[PDB]
């Protein structure tokens, strides 16, 4: 009879949750867990490659529909490319909106880590060449447009003008 | 006696070793060895005072940046070039050249709406009389947003940063 890795990434969340990251051990997740300490420790070495998990977790699990987007039959692919930056813009400004309390712990904790950082934007240059046709250009694609997307300015997504800030950028890349 | 600038400076020397939080105008009128009220006739309020500490700062910095012009005969694509690239190398070598302060004056200011709408709102004005394409100003700051907002600082000396830049270059002109 042993425990399993989600429902300690499960209980592991719970307590985040609770009471965030910094104030989280091992040893409070066992607690929870009614086991014993030592046996955490062959899922993970320590609390750090855990949240490490936990917020991959969260970050690929917000960001599927992204990635699966297709765009609808006789669409070019500029309005293509248009219509995914909206929804990549839309996703992450939704999700501020309804995990906030995640969101912004995850969120930091992703930025505070190059090569998960790095992996992610890879990513969506990836996907932005896959949906635009534009050879090479992703990146730069992604990082035009870095005020809409980056977690740093969220709560700057509500204001005026977001919109017509969002289109006015998109006029100069197209 | 008493001028605002020995006030300013005293002002900015003891927050420099412990920030805007803890430091308080008793702290300051203390150092200065000043009587008390004699400071209110200058600044009611502290912060006041590190709005005009952070104002000042800013100026400095951006100084270069709002004098910038172009040579006769460049393009003013061209300009709009060469000026987006001092608007990034400046924000850069400031960081280099001192970080503390970097960190103390940036973090104050994006947490003040007011003082960063003006300065975005001033750097777009300023590209737009560079580069003549008008209204765009707005939208081409936020474009270059990775290269100039001091949250990303610490990346400018990651790999494939001049890169990066042209890219992005080459995409809005």
Redesign the interface.
Same mark, same amino acid.
């Given at each position: 009879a042993r425990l399993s890795q989600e429902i300690i990434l499960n209980m592991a969340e719970k307590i985040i949750y609770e009471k965030g990251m910094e104030k989280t051990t091992l040893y409070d997740i066992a607690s929870n867990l009614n086991v014993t300490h030592a046996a955490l420790y062959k899922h993970y070495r320590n609390k750090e490659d855990l949240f490490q998990k936990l917020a991959l977790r969260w970050l690929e699990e917000t960001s599927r529909e992204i990635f699966a987007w297709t765009q609808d039959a006789g669409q070019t692919p500029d309005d293509a490319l248009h219509d995914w930056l909206w929804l990549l813009a839309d996703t992450k400004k939704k999700r501020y909106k309804t995990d906030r309390k995640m969101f912004l712990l995850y969120t930091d904790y992703i930025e505070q880590n190059?090569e998960l950082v790095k992996n992610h934007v890879a990513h969506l240059a990836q996907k932005a060449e896959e949906v635009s046709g534009r050879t090479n250009?992703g990146?730069? %694609?992604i990082?035009?447009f870095?005020?809409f997307h980056?977690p740093?300015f969220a709560s700057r997504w509500e204001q005026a003008g977001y919109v017509d800030?969002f289109e006015?950028?998109w006029? %100069?890349?197209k």
């Open positions: 190059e250009q990146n730069a %694609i990082t035009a870095t005020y980056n740093y800030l006015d950028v006029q %100069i890349v």
